Amino acid sequence: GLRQDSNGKLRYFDLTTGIQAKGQFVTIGQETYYFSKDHGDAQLLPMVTEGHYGTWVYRDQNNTILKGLQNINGTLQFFDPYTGEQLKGGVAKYDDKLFYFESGKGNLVSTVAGDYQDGHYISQDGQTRYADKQNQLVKGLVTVNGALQYFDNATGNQIKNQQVIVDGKTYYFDDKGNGEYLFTNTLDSTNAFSTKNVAFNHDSSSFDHTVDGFLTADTWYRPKSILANGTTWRDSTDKDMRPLITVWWPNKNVQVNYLNFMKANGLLTTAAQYTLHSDQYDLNQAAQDVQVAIERRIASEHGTDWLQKLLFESQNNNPSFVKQQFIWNKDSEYHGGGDAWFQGGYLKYGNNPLTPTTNSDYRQPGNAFDFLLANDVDNSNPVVQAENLNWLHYLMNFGTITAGQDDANFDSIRIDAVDFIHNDTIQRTYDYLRDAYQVQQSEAKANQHISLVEAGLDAGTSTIHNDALIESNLREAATLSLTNEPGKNKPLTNMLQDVDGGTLITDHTQNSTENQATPNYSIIHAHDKGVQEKVGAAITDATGADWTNFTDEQLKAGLELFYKDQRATNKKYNSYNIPSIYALMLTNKDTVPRMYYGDMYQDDGQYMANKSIYYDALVSLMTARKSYVSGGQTMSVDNHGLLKSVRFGKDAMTANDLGTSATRTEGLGVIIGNDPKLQLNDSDKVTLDMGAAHKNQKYRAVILTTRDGLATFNSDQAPTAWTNDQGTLTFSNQEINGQDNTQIRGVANPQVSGYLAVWVPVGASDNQDARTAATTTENHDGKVLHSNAALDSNLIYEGFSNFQPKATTHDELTNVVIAKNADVFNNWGITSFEMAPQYRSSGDHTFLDSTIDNGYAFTDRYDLGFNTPTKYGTDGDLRATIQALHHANMQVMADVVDNQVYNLPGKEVVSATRAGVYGNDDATGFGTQLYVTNSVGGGQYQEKYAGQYLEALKAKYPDLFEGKAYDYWYKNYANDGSNPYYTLSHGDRESIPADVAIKQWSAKYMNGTNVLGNGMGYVLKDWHNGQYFKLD
Ligand SMILES: OC[C@H]1O[C@@H](O)[C@H](O)[C@@H](O)[C@@H]1O
Ligand SMILES: OC[C@H]1O[C@@H](O)[C@H](O)[C@@H](O)[C@@H]1O
Ligand SMILES: OC[C@H]1O[C@@H](O)[C@H](O)[C@@H](O)[C@@H]1O
Ligand SMILES: OC[C@H]1O[C@@H](O)[C@H](O)[C@@H](O)[C@@H]1O
Ligand SMILES: OC[C@H]1O[C@@H](O)[C@H](O)[C@@H](O)[C@@H]1O
Ligand SMILES: OC[C@H]1O[C@@H](O)[C@H](O)[C@@H](O)[C@@H]1O
Ligand SMILES: OC[C@H]1O[C@@H](O)[C@H](O)[C@@H](O)[C@@H]1O
Ligand SMILES: OC[C@H]1O[C@@H](O)[C@H](O)[C@@H](O)[C@@H]1O
Ligand SMILES: OC[C@H]1O[C@@H](O)[C@H](O)[C@@H](O)[C@@H]1O
Ligand SMILES: OC[C@H]1O[C@H](O)[C@H](O)[C@@H](O)[C@@H]1O
Ligand SMILES: [Ca+2]
Following DSSP, what letter does each residue of 377-424 receive, concatenated?
E-TTSHHHHHHHHHHHHHHHTHHHHHHS-TTS---EEEETTGGGS-HH
Angle formed by the axes of helices 280-301 and 305-312, nearest 10°: 140
Q: Are 892 and 882 in contact (CB under 8 A)?
A: yes
Helices (H), 302-381: 305-312
* Residue pair 899/376 in contact by the 8 Å Cβ criterion: yes
Asked if residues 690 and 697 have their Cβ atoms less than 8 Å apart, the reply is yes
Quick one: 441 exposed, middle or buried, by C-beta within 10 A (0-12, 13-18, 19+)?
middle
Determine whether 786 is exposed, middle or buried from the number of CB atoms within 10 Å of its CB (0-12, 13-18, 19+): buried
CA separation for the pair 262, 270 (Å, rounded): 11
**211: nearest Cα among 893, 935, 861, 696:** 935
Query: What's the 884 CA to ligand 8 centre distance in angstroms?
Result: 7
Technique that determined the structure = X-ray
Q: Checking DSSP bridges between strand 47-48 and strand 68-72, what pairing results, if any?
A: parallel
* Element of type H or E holding 42: strand 42-45
Ordered by where they begin, the domains of the chain are: 1-184 (2.10.270.10), 185-345+1020-1032 (no CATH), 346-470+894-1016 (3.20.20.80), 472-892 (3.20.20.470)
In sign, the C-alpha dihedral spanning 128, 131, 137, 139 is negative
Residue 229: partners with Cβ closer than 8 Å, 6 or more residues away:
295, 296, 299
The Å distance, Cα 348 to ligand 6 centre, comes to 20
How far, rounded to the nearest angstrom, does the alpha carbon of residue 941 sit from its chain's CA centroid? 27
Report how far residue 666's alpha carbon sits from residue 628's, in angstroms, rounded to the nearest whole number. 5
> Which ligand is nearest to the Cα of residue 528, counting in written order?
6
Q: Which residue blocks in 796-947 are alpha helix, DSSP H?
A: 814-820, 822-827, 875-887, 940-945
Distance of CA 835 to the CA centre of its chain: 22
248 strand-pairing partners: none
Instruction: Please give the Cα distance from 631 to 675 (Å, whole number).
Output: 30
* Protein residue whose Cα sits closest to atom 1 of ligand 9: 890
Q: What is the largest CA-CA distance in the chain?
A: 121
Q: Where are the beta strands (DSSP E) in 612-682?
A: 633-637, 643-647, 668-673
Outline where DSSP puts E strands in 926-989. 928-936, 964-972, 981-989
Please report, as a single letter, which amino acid is at residue 382. Answer: P
CA of residue 1018 to ligand 4 center, whole Å? 18
**How far does the centroid of ligand 4 lie from the alpha carbon of residue 227, in Å?**
18
CA distance linking residue 329 with residue 322, whole number of Å: 8
DSSP state of 991: P
Residue nearest to atom 8 of ligand 10 (CA): 176
Q: Is 81 exposed, middle or buried (0-12, 13-18, 19+ CB in 10 A)?
A: exposed
Q: By three-state DSSP, how is residue 781 classified?
A: coil
Which of the ligands is closest to the CA of residue 302? 3
Closest CA to 40 of 78, 76, 4: 4
User: Pick from 256, 331, 318, 315: which is nearest to 287 by CA?
Assistant: 256
Residue of 404, 451, 457, 406 whose CA lies nearest to 431: 451
Q: How many CB atoms lie within 10 A of CB 681?
A: 9
Cα–Cα distance between 558 and 542 in angstroms, integer?
6
d(CA 907, CA 922): 24
Dist CA 363 CA 349 (whole Å)? 8
Asked if residues 188 and 208 have their Cβ atoms less than 8 Å apart, the reply is no
**Nearest-angstrom CA–CA distance, 646 and 588:** 9
Give every CB contact of residue 551 below 8 A, 6+ residues apart in sequence: 545
Which helix (H) or strand (E) segment holds residue 761: the answer is strand 752-761
C-beta of 308 in contact with ligand 4 (< 6 A): yes
370 lines ligand 5 (CB under 6 A): no
Read out DSSP for 261-278? Answer: HHHHTTS---S----TTB
d(CA 667, CA 695): 13
Of 557, 575, 577, the closest CA to residue 566 belongs to 575
Query: What atom in ligand 10 is closest to the CA of residue 130?
Result: 7
CA of 1000 to the centre of ligand 11 (A): 18
Contact predicate 606/812, CB 8 Å: yes
**340 to 345, 528, 1011, 1029: CA distances (angstroms):** 4, 18, 10, 31
- State if residue 908 touches ligand 6 by the CB under 6 angstroms criterion: no
> What is the number of H-type helices and E-type strands within the chain?
20, 56
| Separation between Cα atoms, residue 393 and residue 432, nearest integer Å | 9
Nearest protein CA to atom 5 of ligand 1, as residue: 104
Identity of the amino acid at 781 = D
Write the DSSP string, 184-228: EPP----STTGGGTSBS-SSGGGB-S-BTTB-BTT-EE-BSEEEE
Q: Sheet harboring 97-101: ordered strands across?
A: 90-94, 97-101, 108-112
At residue 7, φ and ψ (nearest 5 deg) are -90, 5
The total number of residues shown for the chain amounts to 1032
Cβ proximity of 644 and 637 under 8 Å: yes
Question: What is the distance between the alpha carbons of residues 448 and 440, in angstroms, rounded to a whole number?
Answer: 11
The answer to whether 117 touches 145, Cβ cutoff 8 Å, is yes
Residues near 800 by beta carbon (within 8 Å), at least 6 away in sequence: 527, 597, 814, 835, 836, 854, 872
- Interatomic CA distance for residues 902 and 842, integer angstroms: 6
CB distance 176 to ligand 10 below 6 Å: yes
What CA–CA distance (Å, rounded) separates 179 from 558?
45
β-strand partners of 261:
none
